[PDB]
Write a protein that binds this ligand. Structure first.
Ligand SMILES: NC(=O)c1c[n+]([C@@H]2O[C@H](COP(=O)(O)OP(=O)(O)OC[C@H]3O[C@@H](n4cnc5c(N)ncnc54)[C@H](O)[C@@H]3O)[C@@H](O)[C@H]2O)ccc1[C@H](O)C(=O)C[C@H](N)C(=O)O
Ligand code: NA
Ligand code: NA
Lengths: 358, 358
């Protein structure tokens, strides 16, 4: 009969709920059997390995559960006794959970996740991605760079095909892109930096503390990932230039709220640089850059021309320009690099790819 | 994943030669055994299914072959007994070979191809193709539109996750894309359509007869495919408005060389269109619109603000915009939608996806 694959999910946040929904709704010829779901301490564990009885509302089911969440080692031991191939869907961003990735992998358990942690830390844990071992499951992380856009898979494909990436540059942060699309445009603009980031925060786009977006470390993580798949064995997300948008004097301030009240005090610079670029009929963008030839990598601001693909983005789109041996002219892929629905579809799509390979 | 699979390639032309080279020279965790190298009159065929012993120089091998190419009814009669899954790679524009797809699939053999034929035919073939019945070959055609750009596989994924396409539209023809990107730009120019069509020809962007490109027919078949992938049951590439760039009729009435030389008599029309639109800060582009709600697939010229990305294309690149319930703001993918090595990569990309799935 039907081919089955058992799924174990950790986290039911914004991305995790979208994923679960889409997952439980997905029509297909392969059977995606939800056997586990974990959110904080409460957890649904189908000891039997039959589909979790979520009835028609896994939310309530997850609520009324009194099954404590299994310690990680116990999570592996459990999963290891499944009648079918297991796929762990880590919807968290816990570097803790990321520490067990290689343990999960090495025990035949596969992984699909938007979690950037394991993939943008030391090179040897990344090297662990070399799951060519016969006893370990697969590792997919599309939602890890650019939500659900056909990016990492497109690189792995052409590369295997025989192509060679040369230069990759793009916009990998939703928040940062939104800010720059609202701040630096093609038309006359008198908007202050402090205000755009002030609003992005209010709409709920920035992290609880926007300083966590402005230090450009999250894009540096994504860049670290693209750079590696691209052949530039980047040591860490911090081992290369990364321009911080945070005013040095506001680097050590008590609250995310003191930051916002005080930030206004430094519009000066960017207001001028924004202007300067206006004169040159250019725009300002926060990008990541990977130059395979010179093994150089970096993230920061850069002025782009109006006819440039990067000057024509909507809302908070992400963008990635891919230049390769056969692609003299970049393949440039653009679209939403954040949002629950979009991202979950990325995680699930990796679920699909993996379940077929099983 | 799956250790061993058999590749049955048909056609060693522009695309075909590049595919072969790339395949043969590919290093992977899976073994791809070439069990067939078929051409117009002669074919290389591994009667007992051993890897065709054609190291890297297959041409010399094919050449010395006097083994006549097997009619498709006999061919699949052979391949169907293969001890390993069989991936038929059709690198032809053959309607003949296309008519057979349904039989390959029913006999359990998958298909990887850039051949638009079976997918821009009647609705029954399409349904049959994706009937996705047990033990039946899978059918991949990433190269039928946009060469090797991640679009078809992107759509089939987003759709499976649960997303719905609402508005697709793109520049699916390199020769046309080239002409217009050249013809009408943001920077006003005194360029005559006829002069661009002819230069494009001399530079080889065209087919011996530029009418084979101006009739907008290839753009129609490519949109018939996307339309269907999106939920519009298009009866055929000829069941909707398909504006021709050929000087209104006056088609059959002439011939090759004459068409061109006489073409420079209608320019005034298009030149005027290029002007008016220019007044609106817009440009001209030959596209393939696709509206799902209204279920309206069209083809022809359309205006685009300079701001728009369809307005800043490079060389003869392809573009496609994808609005969905989830991506309310279009996912734009642009890049070479033609080219020996890029088109072939797209085909081998599908091969990899299929081998992995078997
Ligand atoms: N080269 C490209 O860039 C490109 C080409 N394709 C598709 O790729 C396929 C092959 O292309 P290509 O190699 O250039 O054409 P070839 O003329 O070289 O044909 C390949 C071989 O097929 C063999 N053949 C025909 N019938 C056969 C049979 N019954 N048995 C065995 N062998 C047989 C012939 O002997 C021939 O040598 C076509 O279906 C084409 O439509 C797919 C997409 C792109 C492209 O977007 C496009 O088609 C549009 C156009 N190029 C544009 O510029 O906009
Ligand atoms: Na992605
Ligand atoms: Na494509």
């Amino acid at each position: 009969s039907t081919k089955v694959v058992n799924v174990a999910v950790i986290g039911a946040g914004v991305v995790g709920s979208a994923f679960l929904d889409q997952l439980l709704a997905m029509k297909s010829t392969i059977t995606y059997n939800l056997v586990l779901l974990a959110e904080a301490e409460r957890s649904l564990i189908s000891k039997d390995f039959s589909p979790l009885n979520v009835g028609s509302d896994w939310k309530a089911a997850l609520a009324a559960s009194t099954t404590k969440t299994l310690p990680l080692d116990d999570l592996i031991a459990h999963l290891k006794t499944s009648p079918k191939p297991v796929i762990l869907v880590d919807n968290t961003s816990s570097a803790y959970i990321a520490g067990f990735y290689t343990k999960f992998v090495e025990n035949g358990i596969s992984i699909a996740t938007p979690n950037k942690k394991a993939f943008s830390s030391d090179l040897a844990t990344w090297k662990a991605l070399f799951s060519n071992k016969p006893t370990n499951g697969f590792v997919y992380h599309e939602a890890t760079v650019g939500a659900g856009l056909p990016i990492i898979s497109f690189l792995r494909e052409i590369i295997q095909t025989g192509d060679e990436v040369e230069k990759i540059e793009g916009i990998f942060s939703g928040t940062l892109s939104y800010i720059f699309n609202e701040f630096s445009t093609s038309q006359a603009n008198d908007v202050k930096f402090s205000d755009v980031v002030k609003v992005a925060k209010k709409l709920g786009y920035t992290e609880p503390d926007p300083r966590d977006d402005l230090n450009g470390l999250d894009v540096a993580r994504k860049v670290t990932i693209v750079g590696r798949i691209s052949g530039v064995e980047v040591e860490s997300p911090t081992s290369f230039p990364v321009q911080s948008l945070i005013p040095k004097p506001l680097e050590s301030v008590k609250s995310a709220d003191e930051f916002l009240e005080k930030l206004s005090d430094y519009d000066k610079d960017l207001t001028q640089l924004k202007k300067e670029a206006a004169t040159e009929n250019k725009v300002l963008r926060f990008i990541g850059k990977v130059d395979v030839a010179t093994k150089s990598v970096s993230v920061g601001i850069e002025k782009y021309d109006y006819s440039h693909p990067f000057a024509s983005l909507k809302g908070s789109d992400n963008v990635i320009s891919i230049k390769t041996k056969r692609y003299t002219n970049p393949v440039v892929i653009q679209g939403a690099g954040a949002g629950a629905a979009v991202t979950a579809a990325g995680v699930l799509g990796d679920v699909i790819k993996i379940a077929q390979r099983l």
